[PDB]
Coordinates of C-alpha atoms and ligand atoms in Angstrom, one line a residue:
X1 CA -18.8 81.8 117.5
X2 CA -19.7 78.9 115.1
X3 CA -17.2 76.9 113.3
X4 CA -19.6 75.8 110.7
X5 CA -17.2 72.6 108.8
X6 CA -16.4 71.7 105.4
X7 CA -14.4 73.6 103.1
X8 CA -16.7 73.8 99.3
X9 CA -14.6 72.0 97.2
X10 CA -16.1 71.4 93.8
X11 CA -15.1 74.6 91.9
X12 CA -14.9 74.1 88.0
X13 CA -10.6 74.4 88.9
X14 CA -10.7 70.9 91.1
X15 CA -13.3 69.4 88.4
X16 CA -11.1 70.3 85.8
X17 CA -8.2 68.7 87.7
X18 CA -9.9 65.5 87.7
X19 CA -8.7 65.1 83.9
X20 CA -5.5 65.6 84.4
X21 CA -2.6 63.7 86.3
X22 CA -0.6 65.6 89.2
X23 CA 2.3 65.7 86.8
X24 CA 0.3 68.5 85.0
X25 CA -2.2 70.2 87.8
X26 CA 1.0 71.0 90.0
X27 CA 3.9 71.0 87.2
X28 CA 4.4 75.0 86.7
X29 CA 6.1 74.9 83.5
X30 CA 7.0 77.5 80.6
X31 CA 3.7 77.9 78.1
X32 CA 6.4 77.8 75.5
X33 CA 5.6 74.5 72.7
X34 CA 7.4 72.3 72.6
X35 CA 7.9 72.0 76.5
X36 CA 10.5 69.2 77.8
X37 CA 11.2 67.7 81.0
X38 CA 13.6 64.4 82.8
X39 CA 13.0 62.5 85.9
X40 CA 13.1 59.5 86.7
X41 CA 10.3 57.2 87.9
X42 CA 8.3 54.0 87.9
X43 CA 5.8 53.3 85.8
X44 CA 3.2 51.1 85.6
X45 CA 0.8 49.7 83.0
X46 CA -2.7 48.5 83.6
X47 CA -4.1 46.5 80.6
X48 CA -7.7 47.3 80.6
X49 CA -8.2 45.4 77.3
X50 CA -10.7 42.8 79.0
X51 CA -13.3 45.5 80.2
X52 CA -13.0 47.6 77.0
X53 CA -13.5 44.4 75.5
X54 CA -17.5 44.8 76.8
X55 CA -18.3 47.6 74.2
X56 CA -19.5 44.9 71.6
X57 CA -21.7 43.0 73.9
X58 CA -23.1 46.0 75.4
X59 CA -24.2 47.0 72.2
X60 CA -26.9 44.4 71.9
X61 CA -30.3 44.8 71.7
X62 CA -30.5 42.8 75.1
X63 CA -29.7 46.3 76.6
X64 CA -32.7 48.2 75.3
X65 CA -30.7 51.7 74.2
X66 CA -29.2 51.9 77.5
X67 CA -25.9 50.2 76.3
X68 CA -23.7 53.1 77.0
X69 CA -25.2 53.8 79.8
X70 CA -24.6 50.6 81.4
X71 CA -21.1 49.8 79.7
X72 CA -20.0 53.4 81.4
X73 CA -21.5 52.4 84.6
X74 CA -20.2 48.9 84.7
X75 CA -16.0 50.1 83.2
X76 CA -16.0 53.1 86.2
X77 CA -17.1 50.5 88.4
X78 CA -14.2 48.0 88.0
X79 CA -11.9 50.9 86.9
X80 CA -12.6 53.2 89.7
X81 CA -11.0 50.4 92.4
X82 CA -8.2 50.3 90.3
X83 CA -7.1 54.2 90.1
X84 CA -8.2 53.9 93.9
X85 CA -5.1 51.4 94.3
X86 CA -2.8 53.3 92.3
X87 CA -3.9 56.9 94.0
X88 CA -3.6 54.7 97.8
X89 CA -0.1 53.7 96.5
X90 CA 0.9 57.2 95.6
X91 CA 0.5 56.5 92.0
X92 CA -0.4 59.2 89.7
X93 CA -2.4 58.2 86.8
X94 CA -0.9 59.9 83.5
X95 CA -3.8 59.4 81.1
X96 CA -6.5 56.5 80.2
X97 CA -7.0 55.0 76.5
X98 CA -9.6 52.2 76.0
X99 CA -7.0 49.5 76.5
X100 CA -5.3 50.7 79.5
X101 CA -4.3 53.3 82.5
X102 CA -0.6 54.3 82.9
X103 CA 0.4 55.6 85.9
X104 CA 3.6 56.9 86.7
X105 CA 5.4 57.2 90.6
X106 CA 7.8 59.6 90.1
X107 CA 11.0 59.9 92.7
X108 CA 14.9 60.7 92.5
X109 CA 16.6 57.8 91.4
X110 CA 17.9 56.8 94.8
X111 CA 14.6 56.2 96.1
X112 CA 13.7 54.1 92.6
X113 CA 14.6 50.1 94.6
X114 CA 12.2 51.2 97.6
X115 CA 9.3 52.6 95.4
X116 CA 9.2 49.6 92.9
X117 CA 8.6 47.4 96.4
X118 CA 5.6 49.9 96.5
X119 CA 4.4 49.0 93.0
X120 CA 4.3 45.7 92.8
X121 CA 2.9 45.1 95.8
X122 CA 0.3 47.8 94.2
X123 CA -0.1 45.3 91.1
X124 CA -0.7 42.4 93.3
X125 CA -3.5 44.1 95.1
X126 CA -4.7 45.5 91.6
X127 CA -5.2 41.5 90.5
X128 CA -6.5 40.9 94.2
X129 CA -9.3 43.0 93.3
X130 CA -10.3 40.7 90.0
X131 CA -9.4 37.0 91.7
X132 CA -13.0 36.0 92.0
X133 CA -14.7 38.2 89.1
X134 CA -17.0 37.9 85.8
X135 CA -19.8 38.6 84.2
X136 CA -21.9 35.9 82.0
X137 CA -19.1 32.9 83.2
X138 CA -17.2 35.0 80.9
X139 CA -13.8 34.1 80.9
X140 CA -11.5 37.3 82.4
X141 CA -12.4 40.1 84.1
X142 CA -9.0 40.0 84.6
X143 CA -6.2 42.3 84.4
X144 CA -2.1 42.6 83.4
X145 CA 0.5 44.7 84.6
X146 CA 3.7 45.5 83.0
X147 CA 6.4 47.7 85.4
X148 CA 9.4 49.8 83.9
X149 CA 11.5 52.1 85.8
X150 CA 14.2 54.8 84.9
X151 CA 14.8 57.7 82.6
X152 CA 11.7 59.3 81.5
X153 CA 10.9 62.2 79.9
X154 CA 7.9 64.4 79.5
X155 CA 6.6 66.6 76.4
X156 CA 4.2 68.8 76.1
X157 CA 2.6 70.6 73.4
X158 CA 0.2 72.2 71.6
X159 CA -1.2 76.0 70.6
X160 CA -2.4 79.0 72.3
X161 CA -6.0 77.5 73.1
X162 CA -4.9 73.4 73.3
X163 CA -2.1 71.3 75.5
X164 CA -1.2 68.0 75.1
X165 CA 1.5 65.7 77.2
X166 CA 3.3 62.4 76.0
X167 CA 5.5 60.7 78.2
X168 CA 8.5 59.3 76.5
X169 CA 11.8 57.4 76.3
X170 CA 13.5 53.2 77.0
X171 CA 11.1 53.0 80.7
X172 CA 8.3 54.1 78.7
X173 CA 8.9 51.4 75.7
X174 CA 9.8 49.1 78.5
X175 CA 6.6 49.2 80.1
X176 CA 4.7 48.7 76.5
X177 CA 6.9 45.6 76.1
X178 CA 6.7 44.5 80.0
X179 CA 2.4 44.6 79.5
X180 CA 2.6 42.7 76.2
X181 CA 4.3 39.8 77.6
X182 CA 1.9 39.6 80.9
X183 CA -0.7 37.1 80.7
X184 CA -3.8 37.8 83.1
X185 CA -2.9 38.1 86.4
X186 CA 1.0 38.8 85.3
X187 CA 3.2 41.4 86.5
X188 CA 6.4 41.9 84.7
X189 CA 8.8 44.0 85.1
X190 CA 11.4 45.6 82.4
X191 CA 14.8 44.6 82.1
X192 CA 16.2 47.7 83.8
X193 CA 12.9 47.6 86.6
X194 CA 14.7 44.0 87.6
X195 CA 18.1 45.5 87.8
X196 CA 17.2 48.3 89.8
X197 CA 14.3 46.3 92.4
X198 CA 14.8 45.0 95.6
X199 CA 15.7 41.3 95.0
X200 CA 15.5 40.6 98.7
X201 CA 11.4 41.3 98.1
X202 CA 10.7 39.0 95.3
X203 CA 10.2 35.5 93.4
X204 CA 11.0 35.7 90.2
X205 CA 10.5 33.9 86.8
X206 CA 12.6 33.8 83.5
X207 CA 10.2 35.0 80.4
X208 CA 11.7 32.7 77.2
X209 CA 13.4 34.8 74.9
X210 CA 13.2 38.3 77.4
X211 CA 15.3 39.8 79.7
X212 CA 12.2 41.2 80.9
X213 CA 11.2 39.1 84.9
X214 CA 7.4 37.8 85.7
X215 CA 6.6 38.3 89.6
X216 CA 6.0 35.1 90.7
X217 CA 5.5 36.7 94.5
X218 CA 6.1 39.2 96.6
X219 CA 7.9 37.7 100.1
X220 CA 9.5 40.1 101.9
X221 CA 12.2 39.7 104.2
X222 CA 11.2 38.3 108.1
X223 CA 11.2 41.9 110.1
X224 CA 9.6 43.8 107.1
X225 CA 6.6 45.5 108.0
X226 CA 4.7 46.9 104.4
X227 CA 2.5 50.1 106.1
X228 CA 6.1 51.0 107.9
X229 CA 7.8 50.8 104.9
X230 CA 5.4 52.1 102.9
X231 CA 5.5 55.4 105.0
X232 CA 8.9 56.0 104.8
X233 CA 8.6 55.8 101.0
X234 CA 5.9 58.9 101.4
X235 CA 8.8 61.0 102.7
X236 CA 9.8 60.7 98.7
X237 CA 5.8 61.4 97.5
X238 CA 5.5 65.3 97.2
X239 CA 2.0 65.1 96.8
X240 CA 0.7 62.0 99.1
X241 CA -2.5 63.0 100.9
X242 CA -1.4 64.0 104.4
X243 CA -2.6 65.6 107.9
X244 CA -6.1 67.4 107.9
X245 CA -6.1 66.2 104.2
X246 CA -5.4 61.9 104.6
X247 CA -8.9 61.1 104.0
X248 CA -8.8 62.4 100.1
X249 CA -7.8 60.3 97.2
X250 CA -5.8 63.3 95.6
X251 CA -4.3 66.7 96.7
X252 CA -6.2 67.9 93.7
X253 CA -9.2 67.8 95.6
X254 CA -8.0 71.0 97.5
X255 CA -7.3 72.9 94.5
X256 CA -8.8 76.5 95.0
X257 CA -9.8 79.1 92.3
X258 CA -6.5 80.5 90.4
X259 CA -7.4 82.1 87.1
X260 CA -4.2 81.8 86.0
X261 CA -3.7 78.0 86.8
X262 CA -7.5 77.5 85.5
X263 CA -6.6 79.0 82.3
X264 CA -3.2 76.6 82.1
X265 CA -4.9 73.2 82.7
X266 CA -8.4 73.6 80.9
X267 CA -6.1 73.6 77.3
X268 CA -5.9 70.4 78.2
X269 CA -9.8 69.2 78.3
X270 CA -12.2 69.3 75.5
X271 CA -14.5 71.5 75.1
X272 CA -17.9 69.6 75.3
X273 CA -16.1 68.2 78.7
X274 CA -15.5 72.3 79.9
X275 CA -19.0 72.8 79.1
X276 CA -20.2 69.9 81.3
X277 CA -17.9 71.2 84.1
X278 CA -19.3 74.3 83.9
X279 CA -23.1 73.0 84.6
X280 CA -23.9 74.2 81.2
X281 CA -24.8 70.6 79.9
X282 CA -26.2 67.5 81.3
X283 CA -23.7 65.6 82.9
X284 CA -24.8 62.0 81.1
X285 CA -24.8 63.6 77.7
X286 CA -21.1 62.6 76.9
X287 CA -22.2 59.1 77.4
X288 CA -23.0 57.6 74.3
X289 CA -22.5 54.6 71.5
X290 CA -22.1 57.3 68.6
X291 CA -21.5 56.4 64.9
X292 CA -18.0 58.1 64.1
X293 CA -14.7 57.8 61.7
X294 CA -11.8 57.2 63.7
X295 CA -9.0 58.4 61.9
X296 CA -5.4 57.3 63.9
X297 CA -2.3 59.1 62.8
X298 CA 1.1 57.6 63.5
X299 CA 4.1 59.3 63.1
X300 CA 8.2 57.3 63.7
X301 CA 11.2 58.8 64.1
X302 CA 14.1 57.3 63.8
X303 CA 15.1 58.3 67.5
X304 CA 12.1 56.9 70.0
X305 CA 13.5 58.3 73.4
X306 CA 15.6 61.8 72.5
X307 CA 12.6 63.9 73.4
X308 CA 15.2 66.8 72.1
X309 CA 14.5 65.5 68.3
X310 CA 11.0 64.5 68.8
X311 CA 9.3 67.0 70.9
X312 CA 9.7 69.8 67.8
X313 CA 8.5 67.2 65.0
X314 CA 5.4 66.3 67.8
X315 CA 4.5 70.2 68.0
X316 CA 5.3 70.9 63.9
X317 CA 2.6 68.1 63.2
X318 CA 0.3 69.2 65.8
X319 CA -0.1 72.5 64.7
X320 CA -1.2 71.2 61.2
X321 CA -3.0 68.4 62.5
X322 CA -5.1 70.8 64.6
X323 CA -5.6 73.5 61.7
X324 CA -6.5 70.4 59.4
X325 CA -8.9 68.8 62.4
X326 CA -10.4 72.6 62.8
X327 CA -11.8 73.0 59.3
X328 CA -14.7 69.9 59.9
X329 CA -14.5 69.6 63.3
X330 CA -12.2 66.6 64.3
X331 CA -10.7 66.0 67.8
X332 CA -8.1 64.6 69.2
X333 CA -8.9 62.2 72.3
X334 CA -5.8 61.3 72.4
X335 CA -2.0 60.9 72.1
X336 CA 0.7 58.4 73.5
X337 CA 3.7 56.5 72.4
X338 CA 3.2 53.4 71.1
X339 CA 6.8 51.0 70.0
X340 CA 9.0 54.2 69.3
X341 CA 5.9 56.1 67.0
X342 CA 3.7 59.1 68.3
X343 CA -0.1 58.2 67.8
X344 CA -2.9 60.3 67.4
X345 CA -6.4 59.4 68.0
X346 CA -8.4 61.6 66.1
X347 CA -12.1 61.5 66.1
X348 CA -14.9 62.8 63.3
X349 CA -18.3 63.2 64.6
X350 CA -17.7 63.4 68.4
X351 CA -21.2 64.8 70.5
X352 CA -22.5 68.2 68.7
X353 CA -20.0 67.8 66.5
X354 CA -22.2 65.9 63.3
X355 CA -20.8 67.0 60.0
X356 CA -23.2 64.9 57.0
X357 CA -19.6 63.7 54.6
X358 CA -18.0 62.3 57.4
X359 CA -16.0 60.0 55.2
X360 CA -14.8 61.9 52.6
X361 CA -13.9 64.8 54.9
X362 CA -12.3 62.3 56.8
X363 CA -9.6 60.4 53.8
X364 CA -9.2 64.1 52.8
X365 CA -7.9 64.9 56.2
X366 CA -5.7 62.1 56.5
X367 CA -4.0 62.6 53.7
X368 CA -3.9 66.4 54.4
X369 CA -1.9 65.3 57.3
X370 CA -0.1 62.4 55.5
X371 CA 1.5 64.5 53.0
X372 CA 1.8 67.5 55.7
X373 CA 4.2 65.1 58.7
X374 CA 5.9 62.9 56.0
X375 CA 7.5 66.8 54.6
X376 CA 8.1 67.5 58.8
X377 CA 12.1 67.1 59.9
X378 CA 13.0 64.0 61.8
X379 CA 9.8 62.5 60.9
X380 CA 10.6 59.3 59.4
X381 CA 6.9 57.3 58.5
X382 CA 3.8 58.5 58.9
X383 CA 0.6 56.0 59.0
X384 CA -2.6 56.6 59.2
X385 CA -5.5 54.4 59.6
X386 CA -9.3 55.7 58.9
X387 CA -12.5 53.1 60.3
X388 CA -15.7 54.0 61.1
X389 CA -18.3 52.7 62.9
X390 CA -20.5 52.9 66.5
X391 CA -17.9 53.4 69.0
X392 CA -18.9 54.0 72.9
X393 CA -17.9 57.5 74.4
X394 CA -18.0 58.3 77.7
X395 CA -15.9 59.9 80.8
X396 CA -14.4 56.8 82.3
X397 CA -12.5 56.4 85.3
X398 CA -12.9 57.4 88.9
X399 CA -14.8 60.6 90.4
X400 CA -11.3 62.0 91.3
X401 CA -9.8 60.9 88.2
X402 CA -11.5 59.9 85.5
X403 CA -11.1 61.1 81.3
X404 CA -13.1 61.6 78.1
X405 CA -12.4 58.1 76.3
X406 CA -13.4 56.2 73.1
X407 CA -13.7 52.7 73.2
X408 CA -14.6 50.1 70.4
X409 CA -13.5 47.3 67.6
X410 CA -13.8 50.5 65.5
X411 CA -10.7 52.3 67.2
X412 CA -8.8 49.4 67.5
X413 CA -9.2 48.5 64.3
X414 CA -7.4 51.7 63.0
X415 CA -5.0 51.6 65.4
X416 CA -3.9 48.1 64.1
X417 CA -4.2 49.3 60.6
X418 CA -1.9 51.9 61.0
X419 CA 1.0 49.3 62.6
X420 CA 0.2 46.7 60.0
X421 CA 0.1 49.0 56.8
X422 CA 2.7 51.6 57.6
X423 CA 3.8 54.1 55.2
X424 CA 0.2 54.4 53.5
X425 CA -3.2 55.8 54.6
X426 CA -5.7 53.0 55.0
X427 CA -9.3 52.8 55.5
X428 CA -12.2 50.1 56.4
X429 CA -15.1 48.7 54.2
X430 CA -17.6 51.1 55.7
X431 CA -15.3 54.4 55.3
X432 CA -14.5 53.2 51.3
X433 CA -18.0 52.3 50.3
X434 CA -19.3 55.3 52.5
X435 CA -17.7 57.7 50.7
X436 CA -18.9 57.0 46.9
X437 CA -15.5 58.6 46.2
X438 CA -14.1 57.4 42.3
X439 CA -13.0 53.5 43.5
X440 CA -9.4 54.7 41.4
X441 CA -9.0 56.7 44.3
X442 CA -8.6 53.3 46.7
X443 CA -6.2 50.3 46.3
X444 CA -8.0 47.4 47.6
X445 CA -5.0 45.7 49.9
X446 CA -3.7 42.2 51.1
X447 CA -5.4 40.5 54.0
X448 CA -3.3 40.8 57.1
X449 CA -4.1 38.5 60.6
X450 CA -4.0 41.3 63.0
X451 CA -4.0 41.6 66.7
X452 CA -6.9 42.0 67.9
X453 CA -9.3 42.2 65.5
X454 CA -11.1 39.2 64.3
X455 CA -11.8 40.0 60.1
X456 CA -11.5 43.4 60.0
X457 CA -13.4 42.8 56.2
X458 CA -11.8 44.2 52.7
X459 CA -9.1 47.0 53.8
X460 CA -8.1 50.0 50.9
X461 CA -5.4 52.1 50.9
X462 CA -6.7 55.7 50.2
X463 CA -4.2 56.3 47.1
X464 CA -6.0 60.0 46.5
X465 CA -6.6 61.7 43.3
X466 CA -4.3 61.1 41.0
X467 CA -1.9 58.2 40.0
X468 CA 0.9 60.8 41.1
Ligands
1Z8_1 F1 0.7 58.9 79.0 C1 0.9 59.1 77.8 F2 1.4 60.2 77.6 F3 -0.3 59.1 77.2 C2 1.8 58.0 77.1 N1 3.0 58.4 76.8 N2 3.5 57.3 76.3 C3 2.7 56.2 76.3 C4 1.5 56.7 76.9 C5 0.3 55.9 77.1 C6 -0.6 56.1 78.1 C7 -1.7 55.3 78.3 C8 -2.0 54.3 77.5 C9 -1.1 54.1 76.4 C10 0.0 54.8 76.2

């Protein structure tokens, strides 16, 4: 008989996958909210902020209404080698934002020394890639790399119909702080990534004022021999691509049809994205430089690591955040930890999702979900910052692991609002005048130099209805 080839491998299960790290497609955990998990790991922190940089010049004229087109095709370009690094290394990317990929190596702590050999010599490869790169002259096309490794712990939550995950804990601050100090081309590693590494491997630098280590080089030891060593780290990689299956980036390229597994990781991916993964809309339509408000929600605790204390504040606001999102069709694209605090990127007027009072809808909602977390347990501030403007949107990564994303001055603008004016809800210029609200509803506030964003313009404070 015949042995005709190929296995079919692009069921909506595996396309699904490819939104989704490992530590989710093949974790098997409780569907019980909050969900909590410990390992230890590595992790490592990709600054992307020079390519999602591009949004603003891609949305000149110059590029004819094909800018987010070509901003999508030119970010998966240049991103694409980098998760292909970090998948070659035995990385697993955790999640994109539009400033930067976090991928995580998790092993038992015995094995932590040998695997952060394996990551640095994955960030120096990573700024390999980028050593003779631009576009325009323009200055970087670059990268930096912060590295943590220890403790970290996982959360998930969410509803019956949506899942999110957060990784938290000091490795995860650590890495935050590691990528903030790298200059382009740097790779630092955390305080506690130094103690544990294999000194024997490296050069090192002093950073002024940090305990934190810059990688000056990589210089192994006379007898060392990388692609030996690097296979006897795989012993430690559960899910390396092996035997009949060493030519594919990820396991979850394999993934078969499982209902029940299907059901599990699609609470993860948005709708629109489901639908596009299901053939039932064109697959460029998600691409797109879309007027929205961006409304950024940032919650402290006074405990930034004891997932124990967090995790069941995290799911209490989530489950009003998504009834209060629900009601005029808000997402969230995304959450992550950012210096102790829980962010939530929430987005008004996503594709097929146009509601005509964006803005008033949106300072309603936020301070819906003000007043709602600052009344939840353990929940110490709550910040919110509301902009709006074109932002680009578009599935960006690699074929094999690649996710929905929103990138623009807009977002980071909120974001930096939200740091800078904690406490408060704050919105831009085009949200205030936007809204034709009573101006008694607004306090116009202090200029603040923020990071990042060259004059964000007049900034309010939403004060709400009433002087009470
Ligand atoms: F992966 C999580 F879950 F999203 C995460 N947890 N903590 C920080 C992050 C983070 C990831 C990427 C960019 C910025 C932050």
């Amino acid at each position: 008989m015949n042995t005709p080839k190929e296995e079919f491998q692009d069921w909506p299960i595996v396309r699904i996958a490819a939104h989704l790290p490992d530590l989710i497609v093949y974790g098997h955990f409780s569907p019980e909210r909050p969900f909590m998990d410990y390992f230890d790991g590595v992790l490592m922190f990709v600054d992307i902020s020079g390519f999602t940089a591009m949004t603003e010049k891609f949305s000149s004229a110059m590029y004819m209404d094909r800018g987010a087109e070509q901003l999508v095709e030119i970010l998966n370009y240049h991103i694409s080698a980098i998760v292909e690094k970090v998948l070659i290394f035995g990385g697993d990317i955790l999640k994109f934002a539009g400033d930067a990929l976090l991928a995580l190596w998790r092993v038992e702590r015995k094995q932590l020394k040998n695997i952060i050999t394996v990551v640095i010599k994955c960030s120096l490869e990573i700024h390999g890639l980028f050593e003779t790169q631009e576009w325009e002259e323009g200055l970087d096309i670059r990268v930096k790399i912060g590295l943590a490794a220890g403790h970290i712990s996982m959360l998930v939550f969410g509803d019956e119909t949506h899942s999110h995950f957060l990784v938290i804990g000091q490795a995860v601050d650590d890495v935050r702080l590691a990528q903030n100090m790298a200059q382009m081309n740097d790779v630092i590693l955390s305080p506690n990534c130094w103690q544990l590494c294999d000194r024997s491997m490296i050069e090192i630098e002093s950073v002024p004022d940090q305990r934190a280590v810059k990688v000056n080089f990589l210089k192994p030891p006379p007898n060392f021999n990388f692609d030996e060593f690097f296979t006897k780290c795989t012993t430690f990689m559960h899910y390396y691509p092996s035997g009949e299956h060493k030519n594919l980036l990820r396991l979850a390229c394999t993934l078969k049809p499982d209902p029940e597994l299907e059901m599990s990781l699609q609470k993860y991916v948005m709708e629109s994205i489901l639908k596009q993964i299901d053939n039932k809309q064109l697959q460029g339509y998600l691409s797109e430089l879309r007027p929205v408000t961006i409304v950024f929600v940032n919650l402290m605790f006074e405990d930034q690591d004891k997932a124990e204390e967090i995790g069941p504040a995290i799911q209490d606001a989530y489950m009003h955040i998504t009834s209060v999102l629900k009601i005029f069709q808000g997402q969230i694209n995304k959450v992550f930890m950012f210096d102790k605090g829980c962010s939530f990127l929430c987005v008004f007027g996503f594709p097929g999702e146009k509601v005509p009072d964006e803005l008033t809808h949106a300072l309603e909602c936020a301070m819906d979900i003000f007043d709602f977390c600052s009344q939840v347990h353990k929940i110490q501030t709550v910040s919110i910052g509301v902009a709006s403007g074109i932002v680009f949107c578009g599935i960006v990564g690699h074929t094999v692991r690649h996710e929905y994303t929103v990138i623009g001055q807009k977002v980071n603008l909120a974001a930096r609002m939200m740091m800078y004016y904690p406490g408060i809800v704050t919105c831009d210029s085009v949200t205030y005048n936007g809204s034709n609200l009573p101006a008694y509803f607004f306090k116009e506030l202090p200029k603040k130099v923020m990071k990042g964003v060259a004059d964000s313009g007049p900034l309010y404070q939403y004060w709400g209805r009433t002087e009470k």
